[PDB]
Amino acid sequence: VNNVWNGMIGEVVYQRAVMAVGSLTINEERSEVVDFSVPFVETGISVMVS
Amino acid sequence: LSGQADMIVAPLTINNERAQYIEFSKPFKYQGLTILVKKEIPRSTLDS
């Protein structure tokens, strides 16, 4: 937002924290601003309607 | 590794023993070892 980062990735990118273990998702822009590690569970987008 | 290749673009499933000293990119597939077997023809007779 407004070319600035709203927490989470912001916390990593402002040297406040050192990792962000959780439920992050890999993306082009996200991997562009902060390095990543090897993915450890497959995921994507899925459809689910009752 | 012995300076004889620079690109390795072919199925090269990532493993610890390889990535110890080698560079990898984000995977472009998602595989997993399974088991293979052949099927059988007869299931019903209708002639007994």
Question: Exposed e or buried b for every residue in B10-26, given b needs 16+ CB within 10 A?
Answer: eeeeeeeeeeeeeeeee
- Binding residue per annotation — A43? no
How close are the terminal C-alpha atoms of chain B, in Å?
64
Joined tokens for residue A47: 């459809």
Task: Collapse the DSSP code of B37 into the 3-class scheme (helix H, G, I; strand E, B; otherwise coil) and give the result.
Answer: coil
Resolution (A): 4.0
B14/A39 Cβ within 8 A? no
CA distance B45 to B33: 36
Task: List the single residue in A26, A38, A42 with the smallest CB-CB distance to B30.
Answer: A42
Q: Cβ neighbours of residue A25 under 8 Å, at least 6 residues apart?
A: A43
Q: Is B27 on the interface with A (CB under 8 A)?
A: yes
> How was this entry determined?
cryo-EM
| Interface contact A38-B14, CB threshold 8 A | yes
